[PDB]
Amino acid sequence: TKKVGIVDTTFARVDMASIAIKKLKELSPNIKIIRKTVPGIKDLPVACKKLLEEEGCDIVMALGMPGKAEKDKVCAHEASLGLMLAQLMTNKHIIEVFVHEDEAKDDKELDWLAKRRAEEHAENVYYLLFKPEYLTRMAGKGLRQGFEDAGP
Amino acid sequence: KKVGIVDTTFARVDMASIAIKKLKELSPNIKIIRKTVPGIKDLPVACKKLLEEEGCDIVMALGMPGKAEKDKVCAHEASLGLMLAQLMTNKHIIEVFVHEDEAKDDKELDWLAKRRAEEHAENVYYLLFKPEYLTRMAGKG
Amino acid sequence: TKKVGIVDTTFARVDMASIAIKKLKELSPNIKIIRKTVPGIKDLPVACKKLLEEEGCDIVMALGMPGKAEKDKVCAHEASLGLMLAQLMTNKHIIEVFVHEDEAKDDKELDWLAKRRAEEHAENVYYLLFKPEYLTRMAGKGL
Amino acid sequence: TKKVGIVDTTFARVDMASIAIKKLKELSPNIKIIRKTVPGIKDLPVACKKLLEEEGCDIVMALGMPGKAEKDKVCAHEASLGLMLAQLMTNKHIIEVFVHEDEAKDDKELDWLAKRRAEEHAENVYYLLFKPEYLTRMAGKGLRQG
Amino acid sequence: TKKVGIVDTTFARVDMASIAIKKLKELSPNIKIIRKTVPGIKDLPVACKKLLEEEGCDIVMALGMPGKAEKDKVCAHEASLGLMLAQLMTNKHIIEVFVHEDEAKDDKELDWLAKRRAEEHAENVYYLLFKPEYLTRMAGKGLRQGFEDAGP
Ligand SMILES: O=c1[nH]c(=O)c2[nH]c(=O)c(=O)n(C[C@H](O)[C@H](O)[C@H](O)CO)c2[nH]1
Ligand SMILES: O=c1[nH]c(=O)c2[nH]c(=O)c(=O)n(C[C@H](O)[C@H](O)[C@H](O)CO)c2[nH]1
Ligand SMILES: O=c1[nH]c(=O)c2[nH]c(=O)c(=O)n(C[C@H](O)[C@H](O)[C@H](O)CO)c2[nH]1
Ligand SMILES: O=c1[nH]c(=O)c2[nH]c(=O)c(=O)n(C[C@H](O)[C@H](O)[C@H](O)CO)c2[nH]1
Ligand SMILES: O=c1[nH]c(=O)c2[nH]c(=O)c(=O)n(C[C@H](O)[C@H](O)[C@H](O)CO)c2[nH]1
Ligand SMILES: O=c1[nH]c(=O)c2[nH]c(=O)c(=O)n(C[C@H](O)[C@H](O)[C@H](O)CO)c2[nH]1
Ligand SMILES: O=c1[nH]c(=O)c2[nH]c(=O)c(=O)n(C[C@H](O)[C@H](O)[C@H](O)CO)c2[nH]1
Ligand SMILES: O=c1[nH]c(=O)c2[nH]c(=O)c(=O)n(C[C@H](O)[C@H](O)[C@H](O)CO)c2[nH]1
Ligand SMILES: O=c1[nH]c(=O)c2[nH]c(=O)c(=O)n(C[C@H](O)[C@H](O)[C@H](O)CO)c2[nH]1
Ligand SMILES: O=c1[nH]c(=O)c2[nH]c(=O)c(=O)n(C[C@H](O)[C@H](O)[C@H](O)CO)c2[nH]1
């Protein structure tokens, strides 16, 4: 529970890793973090798996941004399937942080949205690592990452 | 016997409480363990860890897909993970998903989700102690 | 000698297992059969796998009925994927017997259709177990 | 010396196996062949895997005919996924030979098309087994049917 | 030291392998490389896996071209899933280089686009093998392989 892996891409149009890392060190100052950047979405799964199995990461955050196009939705889906499988093969959680450009109305909002979502899931990593009990307290409360919570 | 119950913070309805209460009702002594994850896609590995690392004989996965057309994709990916976790452990994972699209309002959504959770809680029971009952109800309707 | 596992559901609106079992015992009275009923479609894969690996079944029949919704089509697809994987992980066949309600024009026909399909695949199980040569003779059907 | 497994179905409306087998024995009268017929598309994966792992096949050909209904497209897709997995689990190639009825304008053409495709992939099996170098020579030359 | 596997197809209407190979040897003269050609898209996964596990490749490039038909889109998707799985099963990266004909307006452009994308991913292979740090420096920059980068 002392090590987190953060995998992002060169394809993404927003730097989500910096915000995540800063949030984790904030909650746990001495936590160990390792980063790895790959070209894009479909390169994340094996990078996340290698970190979990070869670098001793207890958990990993996968940061990606599918483009607007339809086929990008397919690539995302394929990438997400890879993430699901990597987790089942290692029995370790991979927090998926994907932000579709279709969600923002502009680049200012897209940048805001991605960083906010990254940071919020960074708290989820924290809770999963040290306060699993908190999440249960919030069970069924309709929490969201990025835009405002929806609530019960 | 032990049942694992995994739910989420994303869900807008608490389905776990109703399930747990139903199980303890049918079997007062059954041991139950809970684990809450952020959302739908985080359920598979949590269910698997419970089956393999906490001795759960069976697990209930509680989730609530969003309304968007993409949440349908996330749900589908999550369900695939649940299918695989089961095949990899040879243990059942009762999937309890409730799409918001099914209810006409939050009052109905809350009712529907809890009712479905509780009913599948009975299925867990039957699978654990009375597998014969389910056969009696085979293809019934 | 040979054992067949039959897995059905409580969700299905038609009893397809009885017809299948009767057909198998007919073609092979010395056939051993073990049944297991689960709630629905998505619960079939692991039940089929447990039968193949934990109960010594040489082959298994999976009986299910997806509903009409386009969702149900997704659940069916996910269930079928599970069946495909269970087979590859055990190197044993799982004869999938799914009947969508959309295929029948009403209940009478649905009941007929499901039972007829179950029974016909029951023959396929038979052939796969004792007369694999027959199937080859029928390779590529004839229209 | 090498062994090739051929798996087809009773669902298919065209016999694609005969043409393939004849083509292989033609190019390699010494290749070893072993056939297995299953009910349909979704029964091919495990049959192909059993041949690769239990019968010593070096490679396998999967012959199937998806139907016209979109439901048939889903089954095909699921079947193809099984074929992909069987290969990754054995580290052996499975040449997928599927022919959708939607491709022909009639049976006359459907029968021709299926047999032609089966036979052409039968050459691919040959090349993969004995002349892997040939395929490289044809890398990116748009081999399909045009 | 360091071996790159390159797998392409006879189905593809453009030779993407030559450009990739030339780019790698350019960036790493002593880089070792082997090639394997299969019929098409769906034959790539096991070929890539055999190279990673049986020929000692540290990484592999998969070059393919889905055809026009939407049927092709399904085959592509199935092929990509195979690539994702091969990677998770070997803990080695497989750089997917697919080029849909739908992306070009003509063959002149299709040929240009495929070669340019192949070459650019050839640099990604390079970076992944020797300068993983570079990719991190470009994290979130919105880089593309093929058409111009999008940028953050
Ligand atoms: O991060 C990505 N987002 C996308 O929307 C997208 N779309 C595509 O069509 C696409 O090919 N990619 C690239 C992909 O993730 C891989 O980096 C590439 O296949 C090399 O392995 C990406 N990558
Ligand atoms: O709360 C969210 N957390 C996420 O990690 C996440 N990831 C995604 O890829 C994503 O698209 N979303 C948004 C969600 O799908 C919906 O669009 C949103 O809830 C509005 O209906 C979310 N929403
Ligand atoms: O429970 C969820 N239901 C959804 O419909 C949904 N949709 C999304 O697009 C989405 O990203 N999520 C995220 C999920 O809650 C987790 O936070 C995510 O799997 C881990 O990063 C969820 N989560
Ligand atoms: O009876 C049901 N049990 C469930 O677990 C379940 N889960 C779901 O996600 C779900 O959508 N349904 C209902 C489904 O939409 C259909 O109405 C049903 O299959 C046919 O009546 C059901 N229906
Ligand atoms: O047999 C089923 N047929 C269906 O059409 C259908 N549709 C649904 O939306 C659905 O949730 N189910 C149930 C599902 O198969 C599982 O039994 C349920 O999720 C419990 O794990 C079924 N089950
Ligand atoms: O003729 C069939 N035999 C079967 O065993 C079988 N099994 C199935 O699971 C199944 O869905 N079908 C349906 C069939 O393929 C067609 O989609 C249906 O007839 C609609 O035209 C059939 N159809
Ligand atoms: O070869 C097939 N082509 C199809 O289009 C098709 N469609 C269907 O709905 C269908 O059920 N099948 C049969 C399937 O391949 C299996 O044989 C069946 O599920 C059990 O044996 C087939 N089989
Ligand atoms: O050349 C082909 N070889 C095949 O093995 C094959 N298999 C198929 O299932 C199939 O549908 N096709 C044809 C396909 O529809 C396209 O015409 C072809 O990919 C050219 O774009 C082909 N086309
Ligand atoms: O490279 C390919 N691109 C395509 O668009 C395409 N479409 C098809 O319908 C198709 O069957 N193929 C061939 C496929 O990739 C395999 O080579 C073939 O199944 C032999 O195993 C391909 N192959
Ligand atoms: O930049 C890209 N690198 C790739 O490797 C790649 N591969 C593909 O198969 C592919 O379709 N693309 C294009 C992609 O679909 C998008 O159009 C592009 O990312 C624009 O956002 C890309 N785009």
mmCIF file of N, CA and C and ligand atoms in Angstrom, chain D residues 98 100 103 117 121 144-145, chain E residues 11 67-68 72, ligand 8:
data_model
loop_
_atom_site.group_PDB
_atom_site.id
_atom_site.type_symbol
_atom_site.label_atom_id
_atom_site.label_comp_id
_atom_site.label_asym_id
_atom_site.label_seq_id
_atom_site.Cartn_x
_atom_site.Cartn_y
_atom_site.Cartn_z
ATOM 1 N N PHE D 98 -14.473 -17.906 -43.130
ATOM 2 C CA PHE D 98 -15.893 -17.631 -42.979
ATOM 3 C C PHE D 98 -16.415 -17.006 -44.260
ATOM 4 N N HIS D 100 -20.003 -15.193 -45.434
ATOM 5 C CA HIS D 100 -21.354 -14.735 -45.123
ATOM 6 C C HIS D 100 -22.189 -14.869 -46.381
ATOM 7 N N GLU D 103 -22.585 -12.014 -48.980
ATOM 8 C CA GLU D 103 -21.571 -11.704 -49.975
ATOM 9 C C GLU D 103 -21.942 -12.144 -51.375
ATOM 10 N N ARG D 117 -12.675 -19.239 -51.754
ATOM 11 C CA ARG D 117 -12.012 -18.664 -50.600
ATOM 12 C C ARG D 117 -11.343 -19.749 -49.766
ATOM 13 N N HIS D 121 -7.237 -19.980 -49.097
ATOM 14 C CA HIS D 121 -6.655 -19.953 -47.768
ATOM 15 C C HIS D 121 -5.907 -21.251 -47.542
ATOM 16 N N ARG D 144 -6.298 -10.483 -51.690
ATOM 17 C CA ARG D 144 -7.630 -10.669 -51.142
ATOM 18 C C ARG D 144 -8.372 -11.473 -52.182
ATOM 19 N N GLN D 145 -8.787 -10.768 -53.231
ATOM 20 C CA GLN D 145 -9.496 -11.326 -54.383
ATOM 21 C C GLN D 145 -9.378 -10.273 -55.492
ATOM 22 N N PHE E 11 -2.705 -8.949 -47.079
ATOM 23 C CA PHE E 11 -3.988 -8.293 -47.336
ATOM 24 C C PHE E 11 -3.812 -6.784 -47.500
ATOM 25 N N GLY E 67 -10.190 -3.294 -44.315
ATOM 26 C CA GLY E 67 -10.712 -2.866 -45.603
ATOM 27 C C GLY E 67 -11.853 -1.888 -45.427
ATOM 28 N N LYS E 68 -12.475 -1.490 -46.531
ATOM 29 C CA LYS E 68 -13.583 -0.552 -46.465
ATOM 30 C C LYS E 68 -14.762 -1.124 -45.670
ATOM 31 N N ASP E 72 -15.259 -5.383 -42.155
ATOM 32 C CA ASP E 72 -13.844 -5.220 -41.876
ATOM 33 C C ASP E 72 -13.606 -4.575 -40.497
HETATM 34 O O1 LIG F 8 -9.987 -11.542 -49.419
HETATM 35 C C1 LIG F 8 -10.668 -11.949 -48.471
HETATM 36 N N1 LIG F 8 -10.189 -12.979 -47.696
HETATM 37 C C2 LIG F 8 -10.897 -13.478 -46.640
HETATM 38 O O2 LIG F 8 -10.458 -14.418 -45.933
HETATM 39 C C3 LIG F 8 -12.196 -12.901 -46.330
HETATM 40 N N2 LIG F 8 -12.961 -13.357 -45.287
HETATM 41 C C4 LIG F 8 -14.164 -12.810 -45.012
HETATM 42 O O3 LIG F 8 -14.875 -13.228 -44.053
HETATM 43 C C5 LIG F 8 -14.663 -11.681 -45.866
HETATM 44 O O4 LIG F 8 -15.776 -11.176 -45.604
HETATM 45 N N3 LIG F 8 -13.885 -11.234 -46.904
HETATM 46 C C6 LIG F 8 -14.373 -10.125 -47.743
HETATM 47 C C7 LIG F 8 -14.568 -8.756 -47.150
HETATM 48 O O5 LIG F 8 -15.982 -8.604 -47.087
HETATM 49 C C8 LIG F 8 -13.940 -7.613 -47.982
HETATM 50 O O6 LIG F 8 -14.486 -7.657 -49.318
HETATM 51 C C9 LIG F 8 -12.419 -7.668 -48.090
HETATM 52 O O7 LIG F 8 -11.874 -7.619 -46.755
HETATM 53 C C10 LIG F 8 -11.861 -6.492 -48.928
HETATM 54 O O8 LIG F 8 -12.088 -5.242 -48.273
HETATM 55 C C11 LIG F 8 -12.662 -11.794 -47.189
HETATM 56 N N4 LIG F 8 -11.854 -11.385 -48.219
#
